Amino acid sequence: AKRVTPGSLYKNWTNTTHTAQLQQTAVPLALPIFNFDDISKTLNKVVSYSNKQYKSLHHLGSFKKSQFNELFQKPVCLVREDATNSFLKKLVSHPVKKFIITGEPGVGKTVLLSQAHAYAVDSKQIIINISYPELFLNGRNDFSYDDDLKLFIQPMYLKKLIRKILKANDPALLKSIELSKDYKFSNANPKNASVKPFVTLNKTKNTVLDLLSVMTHPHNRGKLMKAIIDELSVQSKVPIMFTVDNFSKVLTTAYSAYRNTENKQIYSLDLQMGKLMMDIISGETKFANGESSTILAISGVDRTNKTLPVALGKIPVDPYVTRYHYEPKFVELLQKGNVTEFEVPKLNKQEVNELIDYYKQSNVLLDKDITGKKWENLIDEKYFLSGNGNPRELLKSLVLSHR
Amino acid sequence: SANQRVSSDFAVRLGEELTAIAKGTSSAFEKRDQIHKTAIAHRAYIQLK
Amino acid sequence: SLSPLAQRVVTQLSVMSASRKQPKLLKLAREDLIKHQTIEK
Amino acid sequence: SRSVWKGPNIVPLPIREAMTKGTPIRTNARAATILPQFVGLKFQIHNGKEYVPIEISEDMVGHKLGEFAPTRKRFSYTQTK
Amino acid sequence: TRITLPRRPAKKIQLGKSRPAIYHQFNVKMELSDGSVVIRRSQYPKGEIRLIQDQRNNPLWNPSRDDLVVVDANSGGSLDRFNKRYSSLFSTVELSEENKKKTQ
RNA sequence: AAACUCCAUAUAUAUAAUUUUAAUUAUAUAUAAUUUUAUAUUAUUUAUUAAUAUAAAGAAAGGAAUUAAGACAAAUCAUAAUGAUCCUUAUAAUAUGGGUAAUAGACGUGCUAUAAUAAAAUGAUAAUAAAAUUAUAUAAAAUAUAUUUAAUUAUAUUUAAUUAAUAAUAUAAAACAUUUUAAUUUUUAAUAUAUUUUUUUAUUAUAUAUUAAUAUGAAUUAUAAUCUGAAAUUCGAUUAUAUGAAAAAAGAAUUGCUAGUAAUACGUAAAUUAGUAUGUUACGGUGAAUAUUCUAACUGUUUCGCACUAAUCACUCAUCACGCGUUGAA
RNA sequence: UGCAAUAUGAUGUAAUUGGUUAACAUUUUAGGGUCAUGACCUAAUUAUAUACGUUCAAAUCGUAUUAUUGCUACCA
Numbered sequence A: 001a002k003r004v005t006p007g008s009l010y011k012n013w014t015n016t017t018h019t020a021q022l023q024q025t026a027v028p029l030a031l032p033i034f035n036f037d038d039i040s041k042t043l044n045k046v047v048s049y050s051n052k053q054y055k056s057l058h059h060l061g062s063f064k065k066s067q068f069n070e071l072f073q074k075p076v077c078l079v080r081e082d083a084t085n086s087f088l089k090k091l092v093s094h095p096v097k098k099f100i101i102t103g104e105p106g107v108g109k110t111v112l113l114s115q116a117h118a119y120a121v122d123s124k125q126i127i128i129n130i131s132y133p134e135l136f137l138n139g140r141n142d143f144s145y146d147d148d149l150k151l152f153i154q155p156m157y158l159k160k161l162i163r164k165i166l167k168a169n170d171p172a173l174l175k176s177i178e179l180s181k182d183y184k185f186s187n188a189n190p191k192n193a194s195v196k197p198f199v200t201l202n203k204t205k206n207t208v209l210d211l212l213s214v215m216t217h218p219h220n221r222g223k224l225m226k227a228i229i230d231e232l233s234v235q236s237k238v239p240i241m242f243t244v245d246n247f248s249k250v251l252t253t254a255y256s257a258y259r260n261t262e263n264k265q266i267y268s269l270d271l272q273m274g275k276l277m278m279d280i281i282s283g284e285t286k287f288a289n290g291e292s293s294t295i296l297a298i299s300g301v302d303r304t305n306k307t308l309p310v311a312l313g314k315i316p317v318d319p320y321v322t323r324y325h326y327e328p329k330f331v332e333l334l335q336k337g338n339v340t341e342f343e344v345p346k347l348n349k350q351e352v353n354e355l356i357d358y359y360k361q362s363n364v365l366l367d368k369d370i371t372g373k374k375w376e377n378l379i380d381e382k383y384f385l386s387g388n389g390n391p392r393e394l395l396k397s398l399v400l401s402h403r
Numbered sequence B: 001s002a003n004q005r006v007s008s009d010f011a012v013r014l015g016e017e018l019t020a021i022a023k024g025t026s027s028a029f030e031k032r033d034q035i036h037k038t039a040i041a042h043r044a045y046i047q048l049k
Numbered sequence C: 001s002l003s004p005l006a007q008r009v010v011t012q013l014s015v016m017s018a019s020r021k022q023p024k025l026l027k028l029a030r031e032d033l034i035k036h037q038t039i040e041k
Numbered sequence D: 001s002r003s004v005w006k007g008p009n010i011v012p013l014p015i016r017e018a019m020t021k022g023t024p025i026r027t028n029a030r031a032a033t034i035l036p037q038f039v040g041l042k043f044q045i046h047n048g049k050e051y052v053p054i055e056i057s058e059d060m061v062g063h064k065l066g067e068f069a070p071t072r073k074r075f076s077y078t079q080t081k
Numbered sequence E: 001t002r003i004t005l006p007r008r009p010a011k012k013i014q015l016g017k018s019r020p021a022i023y024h025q026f027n028v029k030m031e032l033s034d035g036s037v038v039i040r041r042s043q044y045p046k047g048e049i050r051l052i053q054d055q056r057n058n059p060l061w062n063p064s065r066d067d068l069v070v071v072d073a074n075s076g077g078s079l080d081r082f083n084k085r086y087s088s089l090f091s092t093v094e095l096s097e098e099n100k101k102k103t104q
Numbered sequence F: 001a002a003a004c005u006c007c008a009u010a011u012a013u014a015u016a017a018u019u020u021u022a023a024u025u026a027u028a029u030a031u032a033a034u035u036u037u038a039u040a041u042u043a044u045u046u047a048u049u050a051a052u053a054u055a056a057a058g059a060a061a062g063g064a065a066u067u068a069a070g071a072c073a074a075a076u077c078a079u080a081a082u083g084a085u086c087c088u089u090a091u092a093a094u095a096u097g098g099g100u101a102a103u104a105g106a107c108g109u110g111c112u113a114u115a116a117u118a119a120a121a122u123g124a125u126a127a128u129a130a131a132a133u134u135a136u137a138u139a140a141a142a143u144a145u146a147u148u149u150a151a152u153u154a155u156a157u158u159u160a161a162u163u164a165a166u167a168a169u170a171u172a173a174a175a176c177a178u179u180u181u182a183a184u185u186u187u188u189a190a191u192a193u194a195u196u197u198u199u200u201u202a203u204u205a206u207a208u209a210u211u212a213a214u215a216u217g218a219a220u221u222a223u224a225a226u227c228u229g230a231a232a233u234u235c236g237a238u239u240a241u242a243u244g245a246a247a248a249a250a251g252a253a254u255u256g257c258u259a260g261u262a263a264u265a266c267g268u269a270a271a272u273u274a275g276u277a278u279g280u281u282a283c284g285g286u287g288a289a290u291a292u293u294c295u296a297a298c299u300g301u302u303u304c305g306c307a308c309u310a311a312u313c314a315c316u317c318a319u320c321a322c323g324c325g326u327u328g329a330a
Numbered sequence G: 001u002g003c004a005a006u007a008u009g010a011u012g013u014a015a016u017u018g019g020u021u022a023a024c025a026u027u028u029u030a031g032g033g034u035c036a037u038g039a040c041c042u043a044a045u046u047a048u049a050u051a052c053g054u055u056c057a058a059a060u061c062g063u064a065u066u067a068u069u070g071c072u073a074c075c076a
């Protein structure tokens, strides 16, 4: 009957490679540690993250599927000098810190986001990451309408996100912040459920560390998150870095699959988790701390419309385009906050050389390119097959494409 | 032998089977053996044409 | 073991029948019997 | 189904004698619609070789005169075995 | 080939114990086509009913009346849709246009 | 029979004042191949020889048109034309309708299914074609409604440009990312986990309860409604809500294909139309594996027999049934 | 006033130390067919007869229905 014995691969190829521990057999290798203050020391080297960075970048969701993260013991990055250094340097020194990462599919838009998150944990910042925004726009989660907060709330995703924040961010950095207002929530904790129906918070005596810990009801979880974000906005002690990946989904999907009570489709801005995420990029949510920083990243698994080109000024404005392919409200929200782009440059021959060197050291290549090939010929051929420096195509050439 | 596995994806099933054969747990070695034994039995009928 | 048509017709003939549907016999005191006799006359 | 905006299919056929007198309307116009005015009138619709008599009912309205005059009659296999 | 339900042994109803049959009936009100109402005894648990077609709106029972509208069941079948489907033509113009055919 | 020929191949030359741009093109003429050599090995009519080996040089490898004489009294007097006949107030002419369309069991050739090496939804700086059509046309954009932001599909409203290497039919589609996807407790929730977070590990629910009956299939029906036409009743194609049957990969047997072929849930155009292709005729995209030992089956010749010769569908042996003749016996 | 054996068919038919189907054949389904006769497939019928006992096994022992054997009575 139940033919699926425990420990048997039953999902698709991608899911199996992503979940099943295919890295249990990987070869350990001593590599440098990713640190920005030592970037001059590891400018062009395939460096591995630290244990702090690895514990983070996991709750945040910085490492995704279909990245070949399982060919090695743990995810690794090349640092580079025209993408990582050129990005983090302006992130440190730019008067207004809000950027969007662009480029061709497979360039490394995510990996650069993960590097930014690693820099944040190194630099003692509170990180909020939304990663795949399709989860709260597809319709596979619960929702309700909040009368006071005149918006739609999604308690399941809200619970997951608050748990992400709490489990990733440093307890010391979170406890360092003291509450500014007093919040009264309902109680959903099985312990002390009957004795008290509402939990209470107090000014300058409780903290955000237990603000996140409080467990409330689905209908009040929206106000819970409002409190989280407003307190983090008014704090000015430690920086807050807010990040959304696959921002193409949101700027191309204005209307969610979530359907109103009259056949209407609820607007993303009318739905919370879109209003919160868009007001911060636009500038309605002001962070007191000087170096809060905001980062966005588009994905190649998403259709393209004129919205982002018009927002970034790459093409003029055509007012006759249909809403399915141009959204003036999204453009206006993006332009009110002075977001500037950042196109990730593709690899060079030298970057391909170092990557292939590391791959050989880790034994992820073949006899084809280890026995009968000369290094110059191999690097030239792979640079040519990778579309002149596309990391995903380079990996696919080296490992996946076997003939 | 790979189609007798569970995974809904042929790539996964085939990879599992190839891994099994690489570690020498194939279920067709006995088929090779039966064919080879039959050839050993019929050696006599061989007639160089 | 009966058919649904059999059950339907048994219900119909239940509506026919007097079983488990009639009330107790009407027993009247002597005075009320005389009253009724006068009414009818 | 004929488009409604075009209007019902109407052909010149005699109705004045049909109402004033009891004269039935014999016709070959099988494609004409049965308007509400024909109820109670006797029609003789051509079926191919003979005229079938039919009286118009309030429910026939909207149908075609030729729906009640079968042109071919039923098949019967003579097995003889 | 016949189907019958079996006979059970009949309960004996003795001489003098045999009561009459008084089935349960209701004093139901029955409204005719006009405003008239008749009280009657019915076994259905419906104390009130109205009729759309009945004696009070039948030509055979109502010869003297000049005008008498007829009606049938509503919200059933495709009735009256042969009129609802054609709005351009509406009620005397058609009567005038049906003057004659001029055929011989 | 081969060559000659047409579509394809390469080169050149000539035309286009490169805004009919496709110069990566169009089509006029010519050249080239039915490929050359060089050593090797078996051999062998001796070198003058082939079958291979394959250093070399070449762009060089296909397709279709053409199917003789005789035949099968093969099909065609319904493409038209014809000899004999046979209808001449019909067997010759017109219109209204109804036939060709009916349905018990048969039988061909096709279309659509029966799920995870596979079917749906999305992919706007619009991934990538070829060959045709448009004066008895064509339908761009745009605007309205089905349906709510759009979009996408169906209808209407206007009709732009072009009788066309210029407008239009027409943003090919499959591939390829992504999401999903019942049988499947292989799943989804609730809380907890933590360095798998689009994720896994716990304890509970998801259990009328593991070997076929969906979130596959789209036949059959109900009802709006819309095209074309004077007019879909018998009988035409369309979207909409509902309906949701058989099918759980198929028995003797059997069909087509040897390379740009088969296959393709790959699409595209034209002819026949006022209108309606699961058919026909053409165009390109992606692209295989299989073969040098079988009895059989057809043929081209051959060798053996022949009493057939309008030739094996040949010819040819009787007594029994029909009529007439002659001779026996008795 | 007691007792015996029968039937999966359109033409009857399995058998002996315990779970599961009980030939043919029949028929439009028909084999291999040079349109073609004339040898499976494909196309019909068992459900251990309505009761009783057991290990996760009762054709097996009783009664009873479809009803044709052979003794005694045969000086009623």
Ligand SMILES: Nc1nc2c(ncn2[C@@H]2O[C@H](COP(=O)(O)OP(=O)(O)OP(=O)(O)O)[C@@H](O)[C@H]2O)c(=O)[nH]1
Pocket: A046, A066, A067, A068, A069, A076, A077, A078, A079, A080, A103, A104, A105, A106, A107, A108, A109, A110, A111, A112, A298, A299, A300, A301, A391, A392, A395
């Ligand atoms: N070592 C190393 N690998 C990298 C780097 N950038 C990209 N890669 C590799 O290339 C892959 C590219 O995937 P992503 O990093 O998600 O690239 P992307 O451009 O965000 O891709 P899309 O979102 O699908 O458009 C990564 O998964 C890595 O395997 C880098 O800086 N260092």
Ligand SMILES: [Mg+2]
Pocket: A109, A110, A245, A246, A297, A298, A299
């Ligand atoms: Mg990314």
Ligand SMILES: [Mg+2]
Pocket: none
């Ligand atoms: Mg020739």
Ligand SMILES: [Mg+2]
Pocket: F068
């Ligand atoms: Mg010939």
Ligand SMILES: [Mg+2]
Pocket: none
């Ligand atoms: Mg003939």
Ligand SMILES: [Mg+2]
Pocket: none
């Ligand atoms: Mg003729």
Ligand SMILES: [Mg+2]
Pocket: none
């Ligand atoms: Mg026909």
Ligand SMILES: [Mg+2]
Pocket: F109
């Ligand atoms: Mg044919």
Ligand SMILES: [Mg+2]
Pocket: F115, F118, F119
């Ligand atoms: Mg499918």
Ligand SMILES: [Mg+2]
Pocket: none
């Ligand atoms: Mg389909």
Ligand SMILES: [Mg+2]
Pocket: F127
């Ligand atoms: Mg395209």
Ligand SMILES: [Mg+2]
Pocket: none
């Ligand atoms: Mg073209």
Ligand SMILES: [Mg+2]
Pocket: none
């Ligand atoms: Mg248009």
Ligand SMILES: [Mg+2]
Pocket: none
């Ligand atoms: Mg598709």
Ligand SMILES: [Mg+2]
Pocket: none
């Ligand atoms: Mg379906």
Ligand SMILES: [Mg+2]
Pocket: none
């Ligand atoms: Mg259909």
